[PDB]
């Protein structure tokens, strides 16, 4: 049958292609949310078969209610259990197959429902462009993308297409307890589409109006509206026995969280269909016709009921990379079906139009729902084809010249778009292992993090944690990652918990990154406990204006950390201008925007740029290694020569800036540091080298020792220099630079002499006051407790 063919180059899309991708260094799950899954499904496994709905290991210190679905979750842990792989690369190999697996399996509940609605020839070519559709439905549905987005399609379009099944039969009356089983199937097709997703309840409404609409067109539509009526009510009860054990997770009234709104939903869909059944009733018995509303009364009691309900809860070529030419070859799908049952006036028909109109109305301009078109684009397409097909069925060779306009150039994006896959790159992992390995008290997180957590009433004060804990700052969608590999905590999360702001002072990610002073970030840091900061190329360079828009409120506000362009004049001339409009015509620019003298101020520049020098409570204790261009590049540049460096970041720049395209991240840094030392770097100011570094870097929050003591006017400062060398072997220096008080200094030094650390100083302090210079070390505990020294200058 052709329900294999496409099966294999589904698995051949899915499985296939991306395999190099999921199955590299480590087995590398993609995006950030199969992390969480996996996070969950660990947990899961270890206190079978129970599962948190609270998650006081992330958002910290305040932890997450968990929107994520019972049914991946315990798919994943089954799946766990049956191949006792529970935990680690194991149970990540095994999970990585699960989206796979349910985008191959996807030909089963569209060839049922594109089969019910039309014949079988359609229900064929159905199953084989659902197989091959790109765009977001195959990227969620790749290996290692193991998400729910894939599950809600599937159990979306199967409870559809076994909801209709369940229509075509329970027709008059023979019902028994095996055409009980046909509603009963499609009601748990629905109560798994809700534990997939909890926001699927909307699956109800849908229905609902299949219902509304074969009633007030009871005249040109028929239909058995008393089965169809009692089928909805079996299912509707169905679902909400189902989603019964998990409506009590959540503290209130969610459309995300497990919550009663949902079971409020599905029962209250039941009574809805059990009100159409007694409609229809009355209408059979002749009641609307003896109060005189003839055959306009059973609709109008439709409408009635219908405003009562409504009463009561009142108080493009994007698409070509998308879905191909399913796009088009499902739009004309659609046409023709809004033109057949309106000459044909059929009920499933008409059922499968109302889905994909509302699907359209609902999710029109939301990127993050794209996937749901994609069964849309392959029944309307299947139905376009089993349409031209039975046209002509040398014609019978023109079917296959545009059977092939169909799925030759969608095969073709499917087949380009499958072969890579995304999830944390080696230098973030690694840098992770490193800090569950490294930073203290690892064996308490390790049995913390396979707690069963208890479901709290609420979440706006600090959790009361059973151990002496830190956290993790770093931008939000590194979350997953932090707490799913490096088993500590994060103060921000892909659910965009955490990331607090500015204009209100809520500490967060947002506020301690783009805090212009230190004080400012240790308010911060101390509200949300930090102990490390995780930060990367990323946030130095692309996501920064990100962080500042959530910490300012505004795109304008945000807009104060950007400056102009570096750029060639028409007769050669290096230049920079602080805005576009100072560069003559003609001129070659650096598509990159250099940052304004405040960004050089900012925790982030600080700590990325700065490698954290001038901070008093900060010090770098790992690092990774170079973004992959300048790894590259190093086989030809010393990188330790400041020039070479500088010219072969240029040379890239000016290169790509005729593509129009930006340069690679590693020499946007190059740029940036270069840009400081030409505009702001002030007499005596913070130096930088002009060079890469790591692409992520890990700092230690650090009371700091106190050096202290008095000095000898004229001396207004004191300067302290030392050289810090990472595990990569860079050098950098660690400046800071303090004002004279009454004949007196003070400084706060973040770096010891004998830390465990592989990034290290490997000079003692140099102080110096105007001419007197001395030398200390500083010792681990003198750090960590913040001890008092005392030095006369
Ligand atoms: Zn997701």
Redesign the pocket.
Same mark, same amino acid.
């Given at each position: 049958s052709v329900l294999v063919i496409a099966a294999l180059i589904s698995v051949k899309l899915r499985i296939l292609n991306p395999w190099n991708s999921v199955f590299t260094w480590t087995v590398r799950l993609g995006?950030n #949310?199969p992390w969480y899954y996996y996070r969950l499904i660990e947990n899961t496994i270890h206190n079978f078969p129970h599962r948190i709905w609270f998650d006081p290991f992330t958002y910290y210190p305040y932890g997450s209610y968990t929107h994520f679905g019972p049914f991946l979750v315990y798919l994943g842990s089954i799946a766990g259990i049956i191949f006792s792989a529970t935990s680690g690369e194991s149970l990540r190999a095994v999970l990585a197959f699960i989206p796979a697996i349910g985008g191959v399996l996807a030909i089963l509940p569209v060839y049922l429902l594109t089969r019910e609605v039309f014949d079988k020839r359609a229900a064929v070519i159905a199953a084989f462009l659902i197989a091959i559709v790109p765009g977001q439905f195959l990227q969620?549905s790749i290996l290692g993308f193991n #998400?729910?987005?894939i599950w809600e399609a599937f159990w979306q379009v199967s409870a559809l297409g076994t909801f209709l099944l369940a229509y075509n039969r329970w027709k008059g009356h023979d019902l028994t307890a095996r055409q009980m089983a046909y509603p009963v199937i499609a009601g748990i097709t629905i109560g798994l589409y809700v534990l997939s997703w909890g926001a699927g309840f909307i699956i109800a409404p849908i229905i609902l109006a299949f219902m509304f609409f074969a009633f007030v067109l009871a005249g040109f539509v028929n239909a058995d509206r008393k089965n169809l009526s009692l089928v909805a009510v079996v299912t509707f009860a169905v679902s909400a026995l189902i989603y019964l054990p998990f409506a009590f997770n959540y503290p209130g009234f969610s459309t995300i969280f497990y919550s009663p709104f949902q079971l409020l939903v599905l029962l209250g869909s039941a009574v809805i269909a059990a009100a159409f059944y007694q409609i229809e009733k009355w209408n059979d018995v002749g009641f609307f016709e003896r109060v005189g509303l003839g055959r306009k009364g059973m609709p109008l009691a439709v409408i009635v009921l219908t405003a009562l309900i409504m009463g009561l809860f009142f108080v493009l070529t994007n698409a070509v990379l998308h879905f191909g030419a399913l796009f088009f070859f499902g739009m004309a799908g659609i046409l023709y079906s809004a033109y057949r049952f309106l000459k044909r006036r059929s009920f499933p028909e008409m059922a499968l139009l109302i889905w994909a109109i509302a699907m359209f109305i609902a999710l029109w301009g939301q990127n993050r729902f794209a996937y749901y078109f994609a069964a849309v684009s392959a029944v309307y397409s299947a139905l376009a084809l089993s349409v031209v097909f039975d046209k002509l069925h040398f014609r019978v060779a023109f079917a296959l010249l545009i059977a092939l306009a169909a799925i030759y150039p969608t095969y073709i994006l499917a087949d380009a778009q499958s072969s890579y896959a995304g999830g944390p790159n080696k230098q973030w992992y690694d840098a992770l292992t490193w800090m569950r390995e490294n930073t203290p008290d690892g064996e308490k997180y390790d049995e913390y993090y396979l707690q069963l957590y208890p479901t709290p009433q609420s979440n706006k004060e600090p959790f009361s944690y059973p151990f002496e804990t830190y956290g993790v700052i770093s931008w939000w969608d590194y979350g997953h990652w932090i707490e799913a590999v490096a088993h500590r905590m994060p103060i921000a999360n892909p659910f965009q918990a955490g990331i607090g702001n500015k204009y209100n002072n809520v500490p967060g990610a947002s506020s301690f990154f783009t805090a212009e002073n230190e004080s400012y970030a240790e308010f911060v840091a101390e509200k949300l406990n930090v102990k490390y900061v995780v930060s990367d190329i990323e946030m130095e360079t692309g996501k920064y204006y990100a962080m500042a828009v959530w910490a300012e409120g505004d795109l304008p506000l945000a807009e104060k950390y950007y400056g102009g362009y570096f750029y060639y004049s028409p007769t050669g001339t290096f230049g920079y201008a602080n805005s576009q409009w100072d560069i003559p015509l003609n001129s070659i620019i650096i598509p990159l925007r250099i940052p304004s003298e405040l960004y050089y101020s900012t925790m982030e520049a600080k700590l990325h740029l700065f490698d954290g020098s001038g901070l008093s409570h900060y010090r770098m204790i790992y690092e990774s290694d170079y973004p992959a261009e300048w790894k590259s590049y190093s086989s030809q540049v010393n990188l330790n020569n400041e020039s070479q460096v500088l010219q072969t970041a240029l040379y890239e720049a000016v290169m790509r800036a005729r593509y129009g395209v930006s340069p690679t991240m590693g020499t946007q840094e190059v740029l940036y540091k270069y840009a400081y030392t030409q505009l702001y770097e002030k007499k005596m100011g913070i130096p930088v080298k002009i060079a890469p570094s790591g692409y992520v870097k890990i700092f230690e929050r650090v009371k700091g020792a106190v050096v202290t003591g008095k000095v000898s006017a004229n001396v207004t400062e004191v300067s302290v220099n030392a050289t810090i060398k990472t595990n990569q072997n860079r050098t950098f220096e660690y400046w800071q630079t303090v004002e004279v008080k009454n004949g007196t200094y003070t400084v706060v030094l973040p770096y010891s002499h004998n830390s465990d650390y592989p990034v290290k100083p490997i000079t003692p302090y140099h102080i110096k006051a105007g001419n007197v210079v001395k030398e200390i070390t500083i010792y681990e505990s003198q750090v960590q407790n913040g001890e008092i020294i005392q030095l006369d200058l």
């Open positions: 995006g #949310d969620r #998400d729910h987005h």
